[PDB]
Design an enzyme around this catalytic site. Structure first.
Site, PDB file in Angstrom:
ATOM      1  N   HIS B 120     -22.747  17.894   1.348  1.00  0.00           N
ATOM      2  CA  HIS B 120     -22.425  19.468   1.508  1.00  0.00           C
ATOM      3  C   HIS B 120     -22.021  20.234   0.265  1.00  0.00           C
ATOM      4  CE1 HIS B 120     -18.165  17.972   1.305  1.00  0.00           C
ATOM      5  NE2 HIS B 120     -17.797  19.031   0.333  1.00  0.00           N
ATOM      6  N   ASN B 238       6.874  14.235  -7.250  1.00  0.00           N
ATOM      7  CA  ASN B 238       6.190  14.968  -6.568  1.00  0.00           C
ATOM      8  C   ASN B 238       4.866  14.494  -6.147  1.00  0.00           C
ATOM      9  OD1 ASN B 238       5.977  17.750  -5.509  1.00  0.00           O
ATOM     10  ND2 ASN B 238       5.137  18.736  -7.292  1.00  0.00           N
ATOM     11  N   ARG B 246      -0.935  13.312   1.721  1.00  0.00           N
ATOM     12  CA  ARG B 246      -2.326  12.905   1.690  1.00  0.00           C
ATOM     13  C   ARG B 246      -2.614  11.755   2.751  1.00  0.00           C
ATOM     14  NH1 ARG B 246      -5.547   8.778   2.147  1.00  0.00           N
ATOM     15  NH2 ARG B 246      -7.695   9.090   1.058  1.00  0.00           N
ATOM     16  N   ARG B 252      -2.891  10.696  10.604  1.00  0.00           N
ATOM     17  CA  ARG B 252      -2.677  11.496  11.628  1.00  0.00           C
ATOM     18  C   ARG B 252      -3.830  12.486  12.123  1.00  0.00           C
ATOM     19  NH1 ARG B 252       3.522  12.278  11.730  1.00  0.00           N
ATOM     20  NH2 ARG B 252       2.944  14.211  12.513  1.00  0.00           N
TER      21      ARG B 252
HETATM   22 CA   LIG Z   1     -15.398  19.502  -0.675  1.00  0.00          CA
END
Ligand SMILES: [Ca+2]
Ligand SMILES: [Ca+2]
Ligand SMILES: [Fe+3]
Ligand SMILES: [Fe+3]
EC number: 3.1.5.-
Lengths: 447, 431
Positions: B120, B238, B246, B252
């Site tokens: 893509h 963080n 991530r 999930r």
């Molecule tokens: Ca991408």
């Protein structure tokens, strides 16, 4: 077993098996393909949500309110069959929406067929019947304690109102408070309002300042003037004000957006120019139009926002006019804003006269001469409607079974746009419009 | 000019007139009709967001980072046309996604044309070129200070990579610019920052990362004679917060066992419709779903609309594909059989995806089978899945599904699956 659903607004939602069977139908899954805010998605990139999620949330909120009133007050005699009927009602209340939601019944159907009286609620009742019989739902409702003949009438009644002195026939008057949960016809405050107040705020980037959970957690059925109505806790008065401010903030900023309402009229314009050529096969193979598909529910099942893309991707020269109107939205060469007015002290404009409005504006002869003559086709007249302050009942702590500087209030407001884009055309359109408002007894357009 | 946009994730965002010129094209508006998580919308109702709003966010986040590095550190001599170029890249990096996003280039195109090598990002570059040439963007690029010859190359390079310093759009002294939109080392970039927060906002998953304060401590330091983007040693909490977001989004939502089944169901219906679905491209040339990637006039009109075109179709040639989509609406889906993982061995490449159902149907279980299953009945789903540079104050799982639904066919499919795992030396399934 109950399906669980993670909704970004309500967290985990437990769905009854009867609800799941109703959801898992093509008549219900078509709500996945209808934008909540219609053309508002083209102004607010976060408002991608569809009628599918909103319907799931209203059914959850409807069941949350009816189940809370029963646990607190067993004297009301709220059965589990009653809870199921309110859930189905909230789940299926928006089954009759067309492409781009209120764009369809608010503008397109009045413009395409002014002689017919049609609402998406009446389509919800008809599509609900089509869903039940095409999917054998009556044996499933019967299996879960429902008496279908009484309960189908009950579910339809809390969606559209009286189907035809106590006018409801799905439940007796001593359970009248149940008719205020899904679509409150009296004060307009219901679990439907709460869902899309919180859902639109969450998707549009607007803040929600009222807690619907607080409303349900402390709601109580109290007697108000020989009537059983749903009353709010007196400590929730500040939550009620914030709900009206949120509703006001949602209307002025999002619902009444000037560009978002122009794009609605542009999609409506393309739909009208394509109405004589788009084919929607319904019952028995009969081919219906976009404006006539509301007459057969098999054809209506296949009438979603897909019509936009079928026109856009079309190569037929018959749809070229409609297709290039839609490509105008992509190029952001939209209709141009001319002005605004209000029928202050006048009869509000009815849906049956929407089609005559662009012709009245073009025939309005300005006193000043003009070197560009505009016709009715060049004009778009957008009638933006809204649709209770002292119609909410409150209960105190001492008497829980007894009733005890607000927001700005507006009404109908009319906008006019011009399809012509050249400076000389916009001036005349303003001449026609300011002239129009004069002999139409409307407010003078503010320069 | 300078259109302001209210996004629920990033708030009010200002769009440069050149960006607006790019967004207001049918090649970019195409992204409004391609779901972000594909089949995940049918499992998570809130996940109705498309690639359009996600691209607007990546373009915004890319411009925020490059502008932050230019202000704190003027020695990098980041120009304003460097900011516009990084903005255009993040804005157009997902232009090449097909219907239902990773469903198209991940599974469908390999199954429809295994010989064809396609991604893509590869299509984002081709769609980017089609957008410029079809809307006269090059004169607008020149009006706002760009050098279209090298800048357009700079856009495509930070989207797909380099077609010895292998980049031609920018010299090595600005190597850190290529780490903003699509990162080859870490995987971290403004692209993942957006769809971490955006997907969480739509899935009902709580977001722990704070990208805003990451853009604050963002500095360009040196690692192994290279200029890279570096985070503070004190902001490691963080990173740990994000790496959990991530992992949570993957475990999930992206690898949801029903969401991935529906993805294969749409791919199956797309395959049974590929012979008859037609999409007009260059010069009225009719194209297939699998061949629209070869001409961007057709690929422009190839979105999630194909799902509804088949579902609403009446051609008896499309009934096989149309009836599979009906089963998605009725929730009569394919049946989970089991999961396995390659033993660190050779990975299962996209070119082999087609032969895998035949392999499972050709396995010989050691127990009697009262039902014989063919290659059609099986669905094989291949789901592919301390390095951060710091500064101080100066690999595959395979799932098998069954199209036959009876309880007595699901038992044989498990025996076929376990035998195919063993003789291919995969990990034994969890019984
Ligand atoms: Ca991408
Ligand atoms: Ca409604
Ligand atoms: Fe509603
Ligand atoms: Fe992306």
């Amino acid at each position: 077993t109950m399906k669980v659903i993670n909704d970004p607004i309500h967290g985990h939602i437990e769905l009854h098996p009867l609800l799941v069977r109703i959801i898992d139908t093509p008549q219900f899954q078509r709500l996945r393909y209808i934008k909540q805010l219609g053309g508002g998605y083209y102004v607010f990139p976060g408002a991608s949500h569809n009628r599918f999620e909103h319907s799931l949330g209203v059914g959850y909120l409807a069941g949350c309110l009816v189940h809370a009133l029963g646990e607190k007050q067993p004297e009301l005699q709220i059965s589990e069959r009653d809870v199921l009927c309110v859930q189905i009602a909230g789940l299926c209340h928006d089954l009759g929406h067309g492409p781009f939601s209120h764009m369809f019944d608010g503008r397109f159907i009045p413009l395409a067929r002014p002689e017919v009286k049609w609402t998406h609620e009446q389509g919800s009742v008809m599509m609900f019947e089509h869903l039940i019989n095409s999917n054998g739902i009556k044996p499933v409702m019967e299996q879960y304690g429902l008496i279908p003949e009484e309960d189908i009438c009950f579910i339809k009644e809390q969606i559209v109102g009286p189907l035809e002195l106590w006018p409801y026939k799905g439940r007796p008057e001593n359970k009248s408070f149940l008719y205020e949960i899904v679509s409150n016809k009296r004060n307009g405050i219901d679990v439907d309002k709460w869902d899309y107040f919180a859902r639109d705020c969450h998707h549009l980037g607007i803040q929600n300042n009222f807690d619907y959970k607080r409303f349900i957690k402390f709601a109580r059925v109290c007697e108000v003037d020989n009537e059983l109505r749903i009353c709010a806790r007196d400590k929730e008065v500040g939550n009620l004000y914030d709900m009206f401010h949120t509703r006001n903030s949602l209307h002025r900023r999002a619902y009444q957006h000037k560009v978002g309402n122009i794009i609605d009229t542009m999609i409506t314009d393309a739909f009208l120019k394509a109405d004589d050529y788009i084919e929607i096969t319904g019952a028995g193979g009969k081919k219906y139009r976009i404006s006539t598909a509301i007459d057969d529910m098999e054809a209506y099942t296949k009438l979603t926002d897909n019509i936009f893309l079928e026109i856009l991707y079309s190569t037929d020269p018959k749809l070229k006019d409609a297709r290039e109107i839609l490509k105008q939205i992509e190029y952001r060469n939209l209709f141009k804003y001319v002005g605004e007015t209000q029928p202050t002290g006048q009869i509000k404009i009815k849906r049956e006269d929407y089609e005559s409005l662009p012709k009245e504006v073009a025939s309005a002869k300005p006193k000043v001469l003009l070197d560009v003559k505009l016709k009715a086709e060049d004009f778009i007249v957008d009638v933006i409607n809204m649709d209770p302050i002292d119609h909410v009942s409150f209960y105190c702590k001492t008497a829980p079974n007894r009733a005890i500087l607000p927001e700005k209030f507006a009404e109908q407001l009319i906008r006019v746009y011009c399809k012509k884009v050249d400076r000389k055309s916009l001036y005349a359109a303003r001449q026609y419009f300011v002239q129009w408002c004069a002999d139409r007894n409307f407010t003078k357009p503010q320069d």
